[PDB]
Structures are given as structure tokens and as C-alpha cells.
Design a protein around this ligand. Structure first.
Ligand code: NA
Length: 123
């Protein structure tokens, strides 16, 4: 069951539709009741591969997503769109494997420092 409080800040239509998935989902589907989030802010940062690197001339997009618990909660940052960097620490789905985004996140850090780590990753 979805925590009740997770419906406090939710638009009335989204409440009915969420509960319909909880209670009478379509065949083969189950709501992840721990997955519900509200008051998310997001934006996209365009990123150019740096001169002299393996990514020179490449145009990437970085999606930043901030939960209602940011900055205590780490931001969700991933590469998005049709051109995703080819790098061991980036998955095909755009997911980024950097510790700053997981174990080493702290509200002392910032969007700027995440950008710098990502720049660093691509060199
Ligand atoms: Na997070």
C-alpha cells in the first residue's frame, strides 16, 4: 500500500488514477507502492564534449530532477535524449555512476559540483 501521506500534495485526478493502479491494475502490472513522489522540479542542461577528448564535438543533454527532499536527498541526474555518452560510468539508459550522486552526496554539495564531476568523468 502507498503511504497515505504521499497523496496529501497530489492533484485529485492523480489520486484516483494512482489508487486504481493500487487496487485494480491492468494485467501483468503492479504499482511500486514505494515509488510515489510529488513536488518534483526538473530541468535540462545542454552539455558539449570538450575539445581534445574522445567526446569532442558531441552534444549531450543532462536531465536534473530534484525531489521535495532536495538538498538533503541527492538530485537524480542522468543523460537523456538520442545521444548518450559512451563511457563505462554511463549506462545505455543514461544513468550515471558517480559516487557524488549516491554514497557521497551531501547538501553541502551543489548542482555546480555535480556538473564539474560529470565534466571530469568525460575528461
Ligand atoms: Na536522491
Amino acid at each position: 500500500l502507498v503511504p497515505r501521506g504521499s497523496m496529501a500534495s497530489m492533484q485529485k485526478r492523480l489520486q484516483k488514477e494512482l489508487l486504481a493502479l493500487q487496487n485494480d491494475p491492468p494485467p501483468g502490472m503492479t504499482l511500486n507502492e514505494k515509488s510515489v513522489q510529488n513536488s518534483i522540479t526538473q530541468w535540462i542542461v545542454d552539455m558539449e564534449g570538450a575539445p581534445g577528448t574522445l567526446y569532442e564535438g558531441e552534444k549531450f543533454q543532462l536531465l536534473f530532477k530534484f525531489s521535495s527532499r532536495y538538498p538533503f536527498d541527492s538530485p537524480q541526474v542522468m543523460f537523456t535524449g538520442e545521444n548518450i555518452p559512451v563511457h563505462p560510468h554511463v549506462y545505455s539508459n543514461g544513468h550515471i555512476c558517480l559516487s557524488i550522486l549516491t554514497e557521497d552526496w551531501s547538501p553541502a554539495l551543489s548542482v555546480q559540483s555535480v556538473c564539474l564531476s560529470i565534466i571530469s568523468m568525460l575528461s
